[PDB]
Write a protein that binds this ligand. Structure first.
Ligand SMILES: O=N[O-]
Ligand SMILES: O=N[O-]
Ligand SMILES: [Cu+2]
Ligand SMILES: [Cu+2]
Ligand SMILES: [Cu+2]
Ligand SMILES: [Cu+2]
Ligand SMILES: [Cu+2]
Lengths: 319, 320, 320
């Protein structure tokens, strides 16, 4: 079970990436001791235009910092809780084998740092999240991210890797009602989200912050679903998934339009850019995408291929 | 990736089928140019007994006309919008590689026709739907269908193929409230459908409109889910799926009772009819099936096989 | 027909059914048998939560119902016994049955009656059974569901522990944890707004004294049903990773899965090895169900700490 022995070499200080970026491959044939530091920050951010929300974050972003390790690594986790935090936080990583996936070993009061160590026994793409009572509220405020545990051979090389995470959010106000929106427990219990978002905001991955790729380039997206409650009917408008690591497992389904991502679950999708234009990540529970903000953009630039996609060729009158 | 060369032979004028029928296998060894013509029609139809609804349709049905092509085919798509239409419409086919799955290239005003061409690069079974703002409304009014992209070698032969598509519907009125029912945007945004239906109506596939097969016949169902919002726990009462193309992909799960069909997704199920009687397609989120209309019938004709299924053999007094 | 091994051989087998969370032993058999299965329906008030009661409708006195274990190709002679204290008739649809209603049509049983019907278990798998008496949603919601395992001919790979767990959504007239005898609420059920989401028919059915157990080093197989009626489980074990999932209960496996979707009226099989001692939590990771509606069950692991795998908290320090 990832039995590649005791750690070797110098301890590696993991470099974490902010969404939507992914750390490079560990490019490593031996297990290492990997030191991971992650700081909780409670901060007001823009959930929608003119709409503020008090997010609780791992590394100041929703989703939180991406962590990349190799199956068989020993991970020395340091959870820091900023002095400015109103409350304690902890971490459950779905990649941990042990109680609370770390929750029991990571209670961190404001201004404190918890250290715990775990072996990454299983390859996969694992949701991590705060596991502080009430757990649903901590998740709903943005306390989730992904940790990639590579297989020992590493993943097949691609041109672009991206980090995207859906979440459902519960404001006291309705969708696009302006001002600082409190969290709404009643709506959260009833699974009636006001917003459904990729990367913590309407337009988090639109305009200048859109994902980018070129015609001919292979694209892998690690797609997390923090929930707390919703299951994503995950689709890219104008693309087909060549490969889906369905529910984030090792085995693949091929030629998929739309894949179900469980709440507190993940998937990996892979496809090749072939036509320039705007491609739209959506929850194909489609009112979420077009009426609650579940939309992110991948812009493809490069030469037109009119043999693959012509664009509109003729308009005519019809009786 | 569907690189079988330039289209060859005679240009094909696709014969589309109305649900629940499927066009025949393309039975071709070569990539072709396939001309597809599909007319949008807005029309009042019966959604339930004494209940009407203004459906928006590709080809006059919900779901829309079934399109069948081969991986590697160049599809020349003609979207016609009937002059009677109040709204413009377009089409996003999940089988299209490029912006909006064709939405960007298919804006069609009433009494207009849009032409756009694409290559079908990926085999699979793909939802198509209108992508006109508000997109959720156009889908909710029934603007969805399936396009089958065959592998180059074709699908394994079966006795029957059926076309079935779940949708969730949002009427101002409650379930079975009589009269012409408007669309309800509030129920749609809140994912609180008044009806969940196979093929656009309560009883669309019941009685004289049931699917049919005979004892001993292999059945393939292309099972679409137009949504807009619900995920189907898709089950056939009294059958087990020998094979499921889970999420409509190439690989297969075997021996599955109930398979989750994503909103804007599809599956293929295969089983063999062994025992005569009525088999019920349901959303096994079971209040949908028995209280909101999500039920369709497959009638199996032929000889009883009491060694597989006896029927009720005995009723006895029980004191317990 | 793979799964047809001809008619029963040897002496009839009187099946022993197990109450959750226990499973019958592997059958360990090389021939098709006539397996006589007897299952009694009992309607009874039970505690759904501390100081809250509910009138459950049960197969064999438990929610979920008694676990049935047979071999692919067995002839099952089913005896459904409805206790005369029952206020409703009941029947049974087993998702492992090939034929009308999965047996529902052959097992209509008035109070104080016994129905017999016979079927061949043609498909290996892990199948939901449930009552199919109108209103079907209500019979399921009152707890009439369980699992029947149809082993492959050679049996499943040996494990240290097999457990039986089944999620249900429940609809009370009152709110979550309001005390007293809670009526079924049909309006909440139709709206898919459960007051409780539970493992094995009650808050704490699988907590404290009733927790599951294994030892460090031991392989665990959990047969996870979802009776619904309406919800899909984002099924996770806090602190564990599924080495293998039989996704949607099918024969093929996915490897290294955190959270697997279990359809309404569906099932999965998860396998993992206990490596670290402590408390592991079965949840619906639609996580407000788990921590606000009671969708929480416990697996206690006992044995030697392994600090190389999980150290526990090593240091608390103060930082700016
Ligand atoms: O087969 N069950 O609804
Ligand atoms: O890891 N479960 O919330
Ligand atoms: Cu927290
Ligand atoms: Cu979790
Ligand atoms: Cu339209
Ligand atoms: Cu779509
Ligand atoms: Cu019953």
């Amino acid at each position: 079970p990832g039995d590649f022995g005791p750690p070797r070499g110098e301890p590696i200080h993991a470099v974490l990436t902010s969404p939507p970026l992914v750390p490079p491959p560990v490019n490593r044939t031996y297990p290492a001791k990997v030191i991971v530091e992650l700081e909780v920050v409670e901060k007001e951010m823009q959930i929608s235009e003119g709409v503020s929300y008090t997010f609780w974050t791992f590394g100041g972003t929703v989703p939180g910092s991406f962590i990349r390790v190799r199956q068989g690594d020993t991970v020395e986790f340091h959870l820091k809780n900023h002095p400015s935090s109103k409350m304690p936080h902890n971490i459950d990583l779905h990649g941990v084998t042990g109680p609370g996936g770390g929750a029991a070993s990571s209670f961190t009061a404001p201004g404190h740092e918890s250290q715990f160590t775990f072996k990454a026994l299983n390859e996969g793409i694992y949701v991590y999240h705060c596991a502080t009572a009430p757990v649903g509220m901590h998740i709903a405020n943005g306390m989730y991210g992904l940790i990639l545990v590579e297989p020992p051979e590493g993943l097949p090389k691609v041109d672009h890797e991206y980090y995207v995470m859906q979440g459902d959010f519960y404001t006291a106000g309705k969708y696009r009602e302006k001002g600082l929106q409190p969290f709404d427990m009643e709506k959260a219990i009833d699974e009636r989200p006001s917003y459904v978002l990729f990367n913590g905001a309407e337009g988090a991955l639109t305009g200048d912050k859109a994902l980018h790729a070129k015609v001919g380039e292979t694209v892998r997206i690690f797609v997390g679903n923090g929930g707390p409650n919703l299951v994503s009917s995950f689709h890219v408008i104008g693309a087909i998934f060549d490969q889906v690591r369905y529910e984030g497992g090792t085995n693949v389904q091929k030629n998929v339009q739309t894949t179900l991502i469980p709440a507190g679950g993940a998937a990996v999708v892979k496809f090749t850019a072939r036509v320039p234009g705007s491609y739209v990540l959506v929850d194909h529970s489609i009112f979420r995408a077009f009426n609650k903000g579940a939309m992110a953009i991948l812009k493809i630039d490069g030469a037109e291929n009119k043999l693959v996609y012509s664009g509109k060729e003729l308009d005519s009158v019809y009786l």
